[model samples]
Structures are given as C-alpha cells and as structure tokens.
Target: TKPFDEMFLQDEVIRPIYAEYAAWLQDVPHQQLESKRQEAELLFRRVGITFLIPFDVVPRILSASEWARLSDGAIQRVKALNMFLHDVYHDQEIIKAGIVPSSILANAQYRPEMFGVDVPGGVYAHIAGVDLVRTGENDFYVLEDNLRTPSGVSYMLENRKMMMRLFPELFRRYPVAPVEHYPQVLLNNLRAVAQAGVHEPTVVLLTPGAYNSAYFEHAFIAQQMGIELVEGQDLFVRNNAVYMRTTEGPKRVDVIYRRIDDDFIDPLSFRPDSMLGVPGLLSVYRNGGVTLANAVGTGVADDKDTYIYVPEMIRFYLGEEPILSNVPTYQLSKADDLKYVLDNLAELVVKEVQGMLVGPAASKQELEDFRQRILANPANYIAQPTLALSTCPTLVETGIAPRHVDLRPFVLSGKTVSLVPGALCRVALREGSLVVNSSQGGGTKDTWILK
Candidate 1:
C-alpha cells in the first residue's frame, strides 16, 4: 500500500520541521537512548502497558517498524477481515458478492467447516496480523493475513526496550508516540465486547502450549492486560457452558482471547485429531458461553487475491477513504493479469499467494524458471514488481549502518490504538543486500518520531 498519510504527516509535523531532530538522531550517542528509555518506560508504566507474562521471559521492547506495520496494514487488514468475518458468519456475502470465488473458499487451508456458526461477541480475528512489505517506490504489498492468533506484537513492545537501550540518545532526542498502551487498548476492546454489557469481564488468553512459537506473546499480552492466560488443557466445556479446567475446578470464562486457530481451538468440532482444543468449545462459543477474540473462519480476506480488492472493500464497507493504498499487483486468477504475470515472470516477483514466502533470485534464468512455475499453475500465484526494501540506520557488527527495513506497528482495535511512533526498522546487516528480518540475520534501528 502507498503511504496515504503523506499529506497529513507532511503538513502536521514532518514537512516544515524536525530537521534538527533528524540530524541529532542520525548521529546520536547510545547513552541518550538509555535516559530517554527510562523516560519512555515511565510513560508505558503510567499507561499500564505491561502485558501479563504468565510464563516468564526477560523483559524486552520492539523495533519501530514492528510498531508501524500493525497500525498500517496489520490492524487495517483486521478491520477488513472483521467485515469479512461478519459477512461470512451471517451473510456469506463475499461469495455472493463475487469477490471470493466459491472454489477458492472451498479450497482454503483454514476454511472453517462450522459455517453459519455465530458466536456471542460477533468477533473473529480480533487480533489480526496482516504482514506486508515495501517496494522501491514505497508501495506496500500484503504478505499474508494471520487472522488466527496473530502473535509477535508482544515482542514488538519487548524489542522497543532493547532499541532504546541500544540507542539511548536517539530516543532521548525524539518524543515518539508510545506502543506501551497497546495491551490496555486491546484489553479494553476485548472487555467492550465481553458478553454484551456484562460487567466484570473475565477475559483470558488461550495458548496451545509453551512450545508454540508465539507462546511468549500470548502470555505476555494476557499478563499486560491483567487477565488469566490459560492453555487448552486448562479449559473444558459442559452443560453447554464454557469453563476453564483450572486447579480451582471449572471457572466460567467470559471472554477468551484465543491464540489457537479454528481447527485446534475446538478439537471436538474442527479438528478431532488435535489435542490443543477444548472439546465442544466451538459449540459453547456459539451459544454465547464464550467469546473468542477473533471469531472463526475469517480467512476469506486473508488471501493476497482478496487483498487486491481492499480499496473496493473500504468503499463497500466503511464508505470512508482508505487510510492506505494498494500495491500494483497482477492477480493470477484473472486471465489477462495471469497472462501478464506469466510473460513477465523473470522481471516480477512471483509469490505463492497461498503457499510459503518465495524469496529473491540471484539469476535471470532462475527467475524465469520461477515465472514458468507460476504460469504452470496460475491459480496459486500473484506477481508484483520488485520493490527495494525500505532502509533505516541500525546498529550492527560493523557499527551503525543503513539497513533494509519494514514497518509493523501493533494495532489494538476495539478501542483507540495508541501508535508507537517508532517503526520496527529492519536492518540488513549485509552490505547492499535487502530482505530485513531477524530470521534472515538482519538487525534493527530505532525510529523515534521527533515531537
């Protein structure tokens, strides 16, 4: 998506000001980040930002890019998915509206069989993480929609603490908006929909187990919200009412911020093979005995092909202007677009819209072969022109250097999301190389928004 906040940002604070702050940050010392981090931590503390780490992790913060992505695409995608969720649950309108084809829906890896199932809160994919990446011209493309228990946000908050410590001076110079308030905002939102006007909402976070990759985030956020973090084994259902299988017997659960997917969330209903689900829990949720943060089967909007129509979705659903713009994309489902994608394969980025992330190529022949593969099965791919990943200054083994980065700010809807002004700036530690991620051996830089 194109950054749609240009006019607002350029006019408000970035245009005719902040040059000195930029220069200071460009060359800021490490000690200042510490001082500023202390100040900032206080702000988070005052805002009640700490998430419940029912399981222990050393305290950590996040990068500014991680913070921005949530607000821009991650949360925005959730809003669209929310509409999609409501539509699928009550209406099946996307199939009717012809945006999502019947075949695609039937073939979805995570399509919920519990169709027409309505839950109490009418919430699904409540915490979506719509991952995205940038191009040379700064256009963003949706990578995938993680509607089911989108984790890693808690890590953003954790990583922020580290960046501040790493570059104390930069943070001291810029008064960035805080990401610390995400949990409170998220908790309040969950509480708002707990049992429809029920007081004293007993919101709890559900996790698969400690071995899960995002187990830390799930636990962290729950604790930050001062809620109970429970596992599947800790929950049980009976008498059409959902209850946790706690050490104190079964306590009725009001709302569940489940990090489990549709299949695993309820073993009795979705995937009987799975041991992570609460038996009959899906039925209980439909009976309003429980409220799931993100309702089930909202994967319709998570597709890259569906993402192409987000602009139309914004108009169709909200009627307000979209806050962001979409990247130039060739949808493989369309015959003409598919032809273009096939012919221009080597020159474009061919993505497995429904499969794993396709990394970059080093040779023209390899890229051409990649293109042929997509052409061979046009239904599974979408292609976009390569965009150079964004860059920011980051601390690395070779001291501070410019690194490829992307923005991912955690967005907590259901209430006002206090954006952490800094971005999760991913730095490519390699010289002249792009792709920025921790798994890929890239580091991060602090993106402090100067007031």
Candidate 2:
C-alpha cells in the first residue's frame, strides 16, 4: 500500500502550490526552522496554550481545489447526521422504514431518556467534528463523526496563529486560508440555536473544571468568544431556567456550549453522583428554557456502530449519494460478520464498542482471546480493513519526513450546516504509525487550505 504524500505527486515532484512552500522550506536553514519551532512553543506557553500533547508547529498545506470536495462532503455528512439524530429522538422513521436496524439504537451510547424531547432548530449536533483520512491522492474516507463535544479546534486556531507569528514570511509565500474566526463562528452558531424569540440570548461555555484534560481548550474558547466560562458549581437551575452566578447577580444563560460529557451534564438526569454536573439542569433543558450546544443523546450518533449507517442515512433521509465513502466495516453483531471476523481477525482491525482500537491482533492466542471476547459480547465490536493512511511532510528528529496524517474539519449545524475552510491536521509522530489521535502520542499541524 502506497502512503500518499500531500506535498508530492507520484513522480516525486512537489505539487504546484506546494512548490513555493517547498522552496521556502528548502531555503530556510534547519536550525532556523528549529529555532522558530521553539519560539512557537515558548509563545504558546506564555499565552497558556498547553494541553495533553505538544502542538505541531509545521503547517499542512492543501490546495483550495482539492479541499472543496472534502468541505462539501463534510457539510453534507453533518447535515445528514443532524437529521438522523432528530429522527432518532422523534419518529424512528429510518428504523421503521428498515433503512437501518433496530439494534443500532441499543448501544450504550444510545439514550432513551431524551426521547420525545424537543430541541431548538431541530438540531442536536450543533458542533460536529468530522475526522477525514485519505488513502490515495483523490480518495478520502470519513473515518469518524464526533458530534459530542469535539475538542482540539482551539489547537487549529492557535496553530494557525502560531504559524503566522513564527513564520510571517511563509504567509507571504503561500495562500493559506485563515482559521482565526472560528471562535466567532462558533459563538454565532451557539446563538443561532438559542430557543425561539429570545433576543440577546446569553451563551456560556460549561466546563467540567480546570482538572479536565481539555480544560485549557474550554477556557480558551470561552475567552476568545467573549463568553463566560462556568463550571457546574457556578451554574444552577432556577425556576426551570439556567443561570450562572456572577459578580453582579444571577444572569440567565440561554445557551450552554458544554465541554463536559453527556453522562456528567446533569446529576439529576444521568449520573446521580456527578460532582461536575448541574442538578435539575436537564429539567430546564427538557422544558426548552435552556439549550445545550449539542443536545443530549447525541453520543448515539457518535457510536462507531451507528456511524456505519451514516452513509445510508445520507441516502435515506437526504435522498442523496454520500460525497464521501466510509471504510467498509464489519459489525460483529451479525452472525455472518462475526464468523468471518473470527476467521480473519489477523487481517482486519477490530475496534471495541466506543471506537477503541483493538486491532491487528499480535498472535493467534491474542486473536483467539479477542474472538472469545467478541463471542461473549458480540454487540461491543466493529471491524474494518486496516487503512494505509496518507502522509504529510512532518519535522522529525532526522529533519523532514513523511508521517501519517488525518484531518478533522469542524462543522457547525444550526439553521444551516457550515464548515470552516480549513481543518486540524493531526500527524502520527512516530515512523510507520497510523494513529493520529492526540491521546495516542500524536501531534497536530496547522492545516492550510489554499484560498
């Protein structure tokens, strides 16, 4: 399997737009680039942008023409996903129509508690982060849809700023699209979905606290959007309306851009002992007085099992062909798929229920062990062919080299589904590694979509 390189074609010549960028990179001394990289780190540290992983200072460039298709596909996919969530909570039309099976909603992430609840704009996934990976130069696959409180977008905004600050000359050399306005775009989307006829609705970012891994991101976005960042203790429900305690007094908060997980959003609704959730907040939300950025029960759509049916959802609900294709997945819930997966565990990558990679089984005994686990709990697994992910030029210890990369484009689904022009390109830092998740020792690069 050939690892597609974004900067070069099959002939190994730099792509047209990348030619200028390549020249700049070649002209710059390695020590200078290293110095600039360190400067970016120091600036970020001074600005308080630290997270679980080190940010990738190198920016990934993509021609505008190449990204248009991906952007369109992402917008369409999120639209369909939002529609699917609405259907799941309301009519179950797709399931009743047999477009998708009944058991798909039976996954643990699926929430029956919020069934029949009405949300603003008929949208559940207001903020969607779609993970995209390319196998060939022209072929891109929708790796996953993270509708439930997607993180790392702050990194995208910060990475672009860092790039421009550290290498101002490079911006003059390339037509990189800007991603600085994401916070405002996000704020606009949050306000757009505020409950009907609430002029000047107040929006707040609800964070678990400073102890959370993405707590920095939560605080950063709130500050950037000029909105209040409140923890569970700072907010409470009064008279079925959500309010945040402030210096002046209690102020009504109409929209909550929550960074906390679904299970911890409301102690009264989901977890009984959740110290980070507001009690009776769900009652207010259910009454339509307060709106959560991503309404409850969206994790159902986030499930890998449910994700397999998203392409079908595009066709079923939207009556259109998917612009992007999903990697062919084998669900072990079915007898035939389970048998085949059991027989070919070595060839495929198996994932636990929540998209946890349990892939490329090390030995026959390990394979048998996985088979036994699946046999005992068949509903908790999905499998797919190991993808040969595309690569980008990343600055490694040996200087520039090709490393596997994936793009996560943030989409806002409110009155309309909107996609930012650029995405956060996460790179697999180690050689021959395919994982690009920040939690998995990966680093992020600034994605430059050419204007």
Candidate 3:
C-alpha cells in the first residue's frame, strides 16, 4: 500500500501546504543542499549536540489547521491520562466501575506502594511524550505514551535552533511557531507543581550520571532552566525531606525533575542495590516534603497494556470521547484474540506485554516458537495489524525520498495541561522501514507548525 506523503499529493505535484517549500527546494542546487547538510553536522558538533542520531536538513511542515487538530487531541489525551493516574492511586474508581480489569494492574509496572499518595495538582505524568503516527490525511494513531522521563524535547529544541541557523530565509518565508520558549515553560511548570506555600522553589534536575544515553539532554535541560543538574550522590534525604549538599551548606530541594527511572530513583523503596538513586528519597516524596516530576510508579499508566484503556479512560473520567485514537490492538490474554493471533501470526505485529516487538516478518520456525511461548502465557502478549506509516520527504544518500516518520509531542501537566506547538519528528532513514528509533538508524527532522 502507498503511504500518505506529507509533501506531495501525487507524482510531481506538491501538497498545498508544502508548495512554497517545494518551490524553494527546486530553486536551490542539489550540491548546495548537500553542503548545507554537512554544515548542519559541523554546527551540531560545534554546539555539542552530538548524540548518535542523525539530523535531516528538511523540516516537516504542518498547516495551521493540521497542527490545531493534533495539539487539541494531544492535550485531551493527556488530560484523561492524568485523571486516570489520579483515580487509580486514590480510589481505583476505573477498576471498581468495571471499565478496566483489576488484573491489568497486577503487573510489575503497577506500584502498590503509590496507593493513596497524592501528587501536586493530582498529576502523575507531569511530563508526557505522546508518540503519534500518521496513516492518512486525517488519521493519526497514538503509538505509545512516554510518561516516564521522556527524553527528546532537548532534541526538538536543538533541531529547531539548527533549522533557524541554517535556513534563516525559510523562517522569514514562513511564520513557524516558536518552540524556543519550551525550556522556560518546562521550568515554570515544575515550579508551579512545587509544594504549597513554597513561594521560591529550588528546582533540580536529577540524572543517573554522565554515562547514561540521555545524560546530554539532562544537562541541556538543566542549563536551559538554570537549575542544578545533580547525581544521586549530590542529594540526600534527612528527616523526611530532600536536600542538596552544596559547598556552602545543605539547601532544600523542593522540586526534582528526575531523569532516572523509578526503580533507580529510590534505593530504599525500590531496588536495594541501586547506586543511581538517593536513599530514602521516595519516603520524602510520599511525605509531601519534596515533589517528583512524573511522580513515582508512573510506569503503570504508560505500560503498553495500560495504553489500550486510555480512550475508555477519557470516556469514563472526563465523559468525553478521546480526540486521539489508539492503534487497534488485540489483547492476547483473551481466548478469541489469542486464537485469531495464532491463526494469523504472519500478518500481525505481535508485542510482548512487557514491551518487545515480535515482527510480522518472522520466520515460520520463529513464529511457531513464539506461538508456543504465547500459549504458555497468553496474557503476556498483544497483537496489532501492521500499519503502513505515513512518509515525509527526507534527505537520504540517494537524494530526497519518502521515509516513514513519527512524532513525539511533549505534553507538560502542571496547574494546566499544555505543550509546545511543535514536536520531535523522527524519520526512519531506511526506505520502507517503519522503525523510527535512534538506536535503529533513525534520524530527526525539525517539526514546523505554521503560525
């Protein structure tokens, strides 16, 4: 099946939204564009934005109406997600109401320890990365939600900066919505969620360390926010309060924008041997002495299994239909679903409930082996139809071509739910590949939302 192309409506004819940029591209020499790509690399290297991911020179353009729909849908989805998390921790109303099964919460991602713990604004996912994929002109499906330490906002900001520097002329031609204010907005949101009566909150960015893959982002966010970026050792809990050990004295830390995972954030409450986490930090968080961005045990909500219920959650909690749709998924735990999946293994994309994609491209022997494993524990898997993800024109070795792309829009929940106009647009550098992960040879493009 032919995927929807963002730039072109038909062969040699550009979409109306992309017509201006297409004309500009036609006027520029191919060699000059190549040189600009090299220039972007050199600029990125000089600015120390040298993560392993490639940066494509072309910016993904979205029309005003298109962005309006996407942003509205994203905000609505996040609102429901936050309400769902609050309800699960406080009352388990969704479960008691029989809309969601209690068995779904029995997994490892569900933290029994977080029961009755109230976060500021009743928001658990203070920062959310909603992964969206386009299938057709007006069809967008959420691939997943990254509520736990979503790491690509820095890349989004950096990509926009690079685009502005490289193509100042384009910026003049098009009124692209400014994403430069994201860091400040993030800082404001973090401060807004600080403990009550704290007029001036001391916010900190907690990172695992220099060795972590997103350590650069951790540092970048901290620098952008003008907050201290500290490791686990730099902080300690005393008398049920978190404090940073500075050279002058011990300073109170009100809000911690933690980049580390839940298990590795509190050694005492979670993993006992975790050197990346502060001892007794979880206790402070629970006692309301400190605030943790993306409050503890948020993994439960973002888990792939939990994702299937988000639309239902919107209906149940907000009494509103979900603006965004989830990709159609079959819960393998059901007898009917399991039987259907087993019969059609070659056509469906199967994924482990814990989160590993078992491809539709598997060999017959591999499929049979996987079927046995699924039969052994049917509840541990899910199946979905393979989607022909929409394509964006990207610069490849063979010149401009359509490559599958996905967007991760960062949603910030504080006193209110909000997000920047643009998102981190990831492109699969390989032709016909659906995978857009940086580890799997994916590149990034600047997302431009027209003003």
Q: Is candidate 1 or candidate 2 better by lDDT?
A: 2
lDDT of 3: 0.86
Best model number under TM-score: 3
Clashing pairs in 3: none
**How does each model score on TM-score?**
0.75, 0.90, 0.91
- Per-residue error for 299 in candidate 1, Å, reads 1.4
How would you encode candidate 3's per-residue C-alpha lDDT over 294-323 as one tens digit per residue?
898888888877888999988998898888
Model 2: per-residue lDDT, tens digit, 10-76?
8778767678877886697545544335434554655656545666656777778778888888888
Which residue segments of model 1 deviate by more than 4 Å? 1-78, 92-104, 107-122, 132-144, 167-169, 331-339, 353-361, 368-380, 395-401, 415-423, 447-451
Per lDDT, the best of the predicted structures is: 3
Off by over 4 Å in 3: 34-51, 331-336, 352-381
Residue pairs in candidate 2 whose N, alpha carbon or C atoms collide under 3 angstroms = none
- The models' CA-based lDDT, in order, is 0.59, 0.83, 0.86
Could you give the C-alpha RMSD of every candidate to the true structure, in order shown? Answer: 7.5, 3.4, 3.1
* Poorest stretch of ten by lDDT in candidate 1: 53-62
* Alpha carbon RMSD to native, model 3: 3.1
Scored against the true structure, residue 228 in model 3 reaches a CA lDDT of 97
